[PDB]
Amino acid sequence: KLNHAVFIVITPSAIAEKYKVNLSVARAVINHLADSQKLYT
Amino acid sequence: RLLEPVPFVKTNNCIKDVDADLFIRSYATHLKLHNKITYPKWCTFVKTGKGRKLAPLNEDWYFIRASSILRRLYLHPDIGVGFLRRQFSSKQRRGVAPNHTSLASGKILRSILQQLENLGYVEQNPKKKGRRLTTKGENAINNFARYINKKVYN
Amino acid sequence: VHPKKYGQGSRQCRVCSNKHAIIRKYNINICRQCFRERADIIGFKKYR
Amino acid sequence: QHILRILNTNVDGKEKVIIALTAIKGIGKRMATVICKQANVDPTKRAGELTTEEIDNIVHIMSTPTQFKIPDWFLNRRKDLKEGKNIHVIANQLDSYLREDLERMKKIRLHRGLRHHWGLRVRGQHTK
Amino acid sequence: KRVQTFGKKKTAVAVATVTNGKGLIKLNGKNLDLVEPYILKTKVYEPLWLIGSGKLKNLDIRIRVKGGGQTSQIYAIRQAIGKGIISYYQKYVDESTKKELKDVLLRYDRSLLVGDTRRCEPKKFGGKGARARYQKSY
Amino acid sequence: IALTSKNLRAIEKVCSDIMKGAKEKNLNVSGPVRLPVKTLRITTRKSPCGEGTNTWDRFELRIYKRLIDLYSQCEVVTQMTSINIDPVVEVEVIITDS
Amino acid sequence: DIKLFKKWSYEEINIADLSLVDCIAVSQKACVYTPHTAGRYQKKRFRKALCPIVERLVNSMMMHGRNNGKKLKAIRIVAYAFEIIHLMTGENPLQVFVNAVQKGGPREDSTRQAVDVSPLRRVNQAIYLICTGARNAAFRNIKSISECLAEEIINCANESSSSYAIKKKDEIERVAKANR
RNA sequence: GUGUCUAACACAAGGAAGUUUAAGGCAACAACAGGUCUGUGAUGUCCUUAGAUGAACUAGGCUGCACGCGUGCUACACUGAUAUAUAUAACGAGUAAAAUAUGCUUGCAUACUUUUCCUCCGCCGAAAGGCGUAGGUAAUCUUUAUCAAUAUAUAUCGUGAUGGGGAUAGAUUAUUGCAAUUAUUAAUCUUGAACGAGGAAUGCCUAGUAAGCAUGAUUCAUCAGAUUGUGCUAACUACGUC
């Protein structure tokens, strides 16, 4: 809908909801934070 | 995920102790670092099998595939090119019609097989079918296996 | 005449010469309608 | 700024560069993948932050395959009929040329031409 | 020396070779670690907990696998390990310890003591399944 | 010596006969080796005109192969073979021994 | 003693309907160190009771079209779902799951009249309702099936009317009451 | 325990298994004016039988297409597609043309030698495919202590007919055959339709089943979306009632 742009608990769907973004953008935020499926615990 | 505690003893020196993907990527990266392997040229353009249609989308895939073949070599001693084509097989979507099995591209396999042989890691004998491993290559695989085994352990 | 060496006219049921329903499995060359008469004398027996 | 448009006024920009290019022509995606590689751009990047020069290079590669390592078996419009070879017509020119081919077939008379004129399937719809 | 058993679910057969040893567990040419699916990893780790380390530590286990897919093969391996552990304690150690061990294994489950009873039913003409039939129509 | 038949009882009868036959000249035999059964399977539709429910029946011609072998001179085994034969079974002699 | 995935203690009890406690995997021999053992669970009338409830939950998750035969994946979905529940509240997810199954079971149902409901059937229906609700939530939406299952379980455990299982149970009971 | 406490049944325990253990095969009496004379030198009668309704040979036709109803396949996505990696299966099945040398008038004649069904392996080919050879009468060689695909593991998309979907079409080089031109079949690149999980109706199914996922065999010179087998991945729900 409008949940997709480039510029401004661990799990990608929540991040995608919270900032209103794609799951690819969520994963990139997860990767920046860190600095199939995955273990967030 | 990467490492779990277990009670039993293990061999600790072979591919039969190793995470295949980690080993395959590491050796491929090592080989590219060394620069013994070449893509080469035309192989940047090609497709990997009609069951895919596409290609691996990674740019270092040939080295990865070469390394993956070398692991299959360590498992299966005297294998040849038709065995390789069959090994790398998948399903092919036939359009509206149902799936049937489809080989990987035989030239890339043949090229790797030849290249490894030129770089001395395998030897075709008059005996039996195809290429088996050279000792120097095996000892290197064991050394890389040892590096990984230490790296996880400590 | 003008001969054809392959496809339907190249073969027949050995017993009856008809070109239909021929068992070429194991090189029998008999149509199953003829074969089921003779399968016992040929040595086959059904069990399943 | 960030969602800049693409070839023949198409508004793509948050699409990946491959996905944008495919949304023109090349959506068997092998064509896009090789063009991306010939350009040497990152396929993960988003279309609207390419500069015009990158786009021009891509348009050049798509338009002219001749100076690139692209083999005849890969090519769009592979032999082109007459003794004078032409290759890789693509896009609206391909569509126009194909219309010209159907017209040429019709004038000559070929079964496919005739079926195109009737409005019948070449492979046939089979009874129903 | 050597004691021998096997396990058999569906097609799959896993033969277990239990020799006097030091705590090694193999599956053909490959270490026990290389089962791969996490669920089926636990399934073969299960008997290791049931007999603990110090009763494992004077025996080596080698297992030889033919037939079936992974879930069937792992259950065959698990059954072969169960029977294997018991056979070693019956041939070398003691009957009373074997009975004590078997009690533990029984308390966990029957499937590492007694194999599966399920086997395939043949296809019969008039449908894709064994029993399931092509649609009737009017 | 290899024995092939489609009849169980005839092959087994030959087995007892060859065991006796071997002991007559007190020969050194390796025990009879039963080779994997081959079945000639025909899965046959019932009905000559293909009527009613489709209905298939499965016919089997099951051939049994067995091998019993002997370390003995060439003449002795061929002569033993010629006394031991009956018409129904298929016999092959492969012995070059001494 | 026995802990699920080597993690979850799952020795704690829930009061429930008493009959429901008998049905759920309270027993030691119904407990396992990681899901899946697959005994023969059709054989006798009450035989289904003896099945591990996690084995039943994964089997329900494994249901429907594309999901069929993906038992390991159904195990991964529940394992992921348990992690999510643990994050959302620090409670033991298995205990929460039992609470959701206890909550979800219908007390009465409707017939051509209205009837009480078997405790084994109540568990079977509850798991079915929670998984079907999870699928409905999953299909063509942002939320992963593990998230949906966790979300449904927490809502059902809470006793929220936004739960698909609670809503369906309420409606089923309400129609049964409406007739009788 | 129940049962005339008879024939017998019910539950639990023991047990690899406890209903006749599960699955097949064989299938009465008496019918049907069911189907099959296009399976048959089984066959009555009738037509026809040499400008033959026989034999044989060349095309075209059986897939035609304003359109209607059966049976199947493929989809409608994120528990998914895409790309790598890891694992693996059971039942199988496999031996009179052509080519080359010599003599004659591009052709003919004669001589002589392989292929023939399965192809390992080694070269060349994006690919299809090609070339060179080796073993196979077959528990031996193809090839089966490994010949499948779903599985599963890590990566790429991120709900938008979207990268779902592959209808539809164009341009290729191959393959079988005298002949492929009603796209024969094959791959390569491009082309990117309907379809947002199906209304009234209605099919099959109770334990390794159901469902999904494959694959061998059958026809076959040429071809599986069919049928018939075979396996792996392994459900739900009563467990009965008229």
In the DSSP assignment, the letter for residue D6 is B
Please answer yes or no on whether A17 and G144 come within 8 Å at the CB atom.
Answer: no
Binding site listing of C: 13, 16, 31, 34
CA distances from G28 to B70, D58, E42, G24, G25 (A): 48, 66, 18, 11, 8
**Residue F33: HSE in the Cβ half-sphere, 13 Å Cα cutoff:** 9
This structure's resolution (Å) is 4.7
In the DSSP assignment, the letter for residue G19 is H
Phi, psi of G75 (to 5 degrees): -60, -45
Please answer yes or no on whether B53 and D28 come within 8 Å at the CB atom.
Answer: yes
| Length in residues, chain E | 138
Q: Is G70 an 8 Å CB contact of chain A? A: no
Q: Is the dihedral of CA C15, C17, C22, C28 positive or negative?
A: positive
Kindly report which amino acid residue has its CA closest to the C1' atom of nucleotide H123: B110
Q: Write down which residues 83-142 in B have CB closer than 7 A to strand H.
A: 83-84, 86-101, 103, 105-108, 110, 113-114, 124, 129-131
C21, C28 Cβ separation under 8 angstroms: no
B7, D34 Cβ separation under 8 angstroms: no
Kindly report which amino acid residue has its CA closest to the C1' atom of nucleotide H72: E134
> Which chains does D contact via 3+ CB–CB distances below 8 A?
A, B
Inter-helix orientation angle G119-138/G93-104, to 10°: 110
Largest CA distance in chain A: 30
Q: Give residue G172's Cα distance to chain centre.
A: 18
E87, E102 Cβ separation under 8 angstroms: no
Residues of E in Cβ contact (< 8 Å) with G75: 39
Rounded to the nearest angstrom, the minimum Cα separation between E38 and chain G is: 9
Query: What is the token pair recorded at G180?
Result: 């009788």
Please answer yes or no on whether E107 and G40 come within 8 Å at the CB atom.
Answer: no
**Under DSSP, is residue F69 helix (H, G, I), strand (E, B) or coil?**
strand
Please answer yes or no on whether G80 and A37 come within 8 Å at the CB atom.
Answer: yes
DSSP letter string over chain E? -EEEEEEEETTEEEEEEEEE-SSBEEETTEEGGGG-SHHHHHHHHHHHHHHHHHHHTTEEEEEEEESS-HHHHHHHHHHHHHHHHHHHIIIII-HHHHHHHHHHHHHH-STTTS-----PPPP-SSSSSSS--PPP--
3-state secondary structure chain B: CCCCCCCCECCCCCHHHCCHHHHHHHHHHHHHHHCCCCCCHHHHCCCCECCCCCCCCCCCHHHHHHHHHHHHHHHCCCCCHHHHHHHCCEEEEECCEEEEEECECHHHHHHHHHHHHHCCCEEECCCCCCEEECHHHHHHHHHHHHHHHHHHHC
Q: Please, where are the H alpha helices in G5-92?
A: 19-23, 53-62, 71-88
B18, B145 Cβ separation under 8 angstroms: yes
Q: Write down which residues 47-76 in G have CB closer than 7 A to strand H.
A: 47-48, 51, 56, 59-74, 76
Residue G79 CA to residue G97 CA, distance in Å, equals 12
> Is strand H in 7 Å reach of the CB of F20?
no
CA distances from G123 to D12, G16, G61, G132, G169 (A): 52, 11, 14, 14, 12
Which among G16, G174, G6 has a CA at the least distance from the CA of G95? G16
Whole-number distance in Å between B53 CA and H189 C1': 11
Rounded to the nearest angstrom, the minimum Cα separation between D30 and chain A is: 23
Residues of G in Cβ contact (< 8 Å) with A13: 142-144, 147
D89, D62 Cβ separation under 8 angstroms: no
Q: Give residue D123's Cα distance to chain centre.
A: 23
Which among B38, B35, B37, B55 has a CA at the least distance from the CA of B46? B55
Residue G25 CA to residue G39 CA, distance in Å, equals 14
| Length in residues, chain B | 154
Kindly report which amino acid residue has its CA closest to the C1' atom of nucleotide H76: G140
Mutation pick from A2, A24, A25, A37 vs chain G, by most beta carbons of G within 10 Å, is A37
> Is strand H in 7 Å reach of the CB of E123?
yes
Q: Radius of gyration over alpha carbons of chain G, in Å?
A: 16
Residue E134 CA to residue E126 CA, distance in Å, equals 6
First to last CA, chain B: 16
Q: Is G144 an 8 Å CB contact of chain A? A: yes
Which among G178, G126, G180 has a CA at the least distance from the CA of G153? G126
Rounded to the nearest angstrom, the minimum Cα separation between E30 and chain B is: 5
Query: What is the token pair recorded at B28?
Result: 């491929």
First to last CA, chain A: 30
Residue B66 CA to residue F75 CA, distance in Å, equals 60
Residue G78 CA to residue G5 CA, distance in Å, equals 11
Rounded to the nearest angstrom, the minimum Cα separation between C5 and chain F is: 27
Residue C44: is it exposed, middle or buried by C-beta count within 10 angstroms (0-12/13-18/19+)?
Answer: buried
Please answer yes or no on whether B16 and E32 come within 8 Å at the CB atom.
Answer: no
For chain E, positions 79-138, list CB contacts with chain F under 8 A. 125-126
Q: Find tokens 């298929």 and name the residue.
A: F90
Please answer yes or no on whether B6 and E24 come within 8 Å at the CB atom.
Answer: no
First to last CA, chain G: 48
Torsion of CA G39, G43, G46, G49, to 10 degrees: 10
Residue G125 CA to residue G166 CA, distance in Å, equals 12
H/E element holding G164? Answer: helix G164-179
- A15 in the Ramachandran plot: left (φ > 0), alpha (ψ -120 to 50) or beta? alpha
Please answer yes or no on whether C32 and F60 come within 8 Å at the CB atom.
Answer: no
Kindly report which amino acid residue has its CA closest to the C1' atom of nucleotide H202: E137
The residues with which E59 forms a beta bridge, in sequence order, are: E20
Binding site listing of C for Zn(2+): 13, 16, 31, 34
> Is strand H in 7 Å reach of the CB of B43?
no
Whole-number distance in Å between D72 CA and H220 C1': 35
Query: What is the token pair recorded at D128?
Result: 């129903």
**Residue G176: HSE in the Cβ half-sphere, 13 Å Cα cutoff:** 16
